Design a protein around this ligand. Sequence first.
Ligand code: UDP
Length: 327
Amino acid sequence: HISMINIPAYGHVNPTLALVEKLCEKGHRVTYATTEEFAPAVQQAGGEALIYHTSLNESLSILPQLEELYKDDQPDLIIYDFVALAGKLFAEKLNVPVIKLCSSYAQNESFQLGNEDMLKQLAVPEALNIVFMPKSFQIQHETFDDRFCFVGPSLGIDKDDRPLMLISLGTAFNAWPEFYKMCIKAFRDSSWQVIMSVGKTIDPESLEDIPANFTIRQSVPQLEVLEKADLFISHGGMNSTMEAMNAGVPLVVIPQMYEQELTANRVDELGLGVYLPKEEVTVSSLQEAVQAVSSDQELLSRVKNMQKDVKEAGGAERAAAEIEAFM
Ligand SMILES: O=c1ccn([C@@H]2O[C@H](COP(=O)(O)OP(=O)(O)O)[C@@H](O)[C@H]2O)c(=O)[nH]1
């Protein structure tokens, strides 16, 4: 019986679901402490949905007591997301084995998530640490040892004869209507076919004169669109970045917060795409960026290499195999 404890967010829940499924198809009782918006997703994966009140969209550790209502169903191993500190604490109260999942960058002794910002121990890595990226993409991957398992992404339309482009700012920092308007004007009369995810904050009808080569929706099946996409204007979330590599889709990254800037720079230094800072996003800079990487055959070759790295990392299957072997 394995307990999954995670914060309420797609960027943290999505790579977990494929891991839930794999564990369920090997005969483990996967319980999962989430909220309500995520309960149907964990249960489609075959997990035990344990709805709990969060009332939050710093530490806010008023959830451990809410997830303690189940001492009768005490777990044999707790799996918690790095930001989900409740699971880390809970797992130390029962002295139960515990494993850390890294939906973003892994942190060790040489690298820590922080832009020189001091703000008042548990961040030390556990015995096993599953990171949802290949080793080659982890920052300072040479300083990481065998307690970190880089399994890569954890994953579970008619097109035409023209290049297909996907535009999405993720599921959190998507409230930026000026960007969407600039994208429409940037590729209004182009040969590109655009599929743009606008978020639940904007309404497709609101936008005026929607071009015939554009398709705007509040949400979109990213994975399905990435299998036929030729380019992906993204925001630097780890999931979207790793899903683009899995699909072999080069990137234009426009980050909205610090971590996404790390990834944006990471993508740029690996030659997997272009980092276009938010403050430089214009109609012309969007056109120049898309034109720069879409005609760069060498950059595409490096994207194909990172695709192979992503495949070989193992995915949800190798992650579940590592959890079972961890006993
Ligand atoms: O229209 C959309 C927008 C996002 N996603 C998914 O939502 C996640 C985005 O998380 P990411 O870590 O990339 O950024 P965040 O949304 O947490 O900022 C990924 O799994 C995407 O595949 C999706 O399926 N459709």
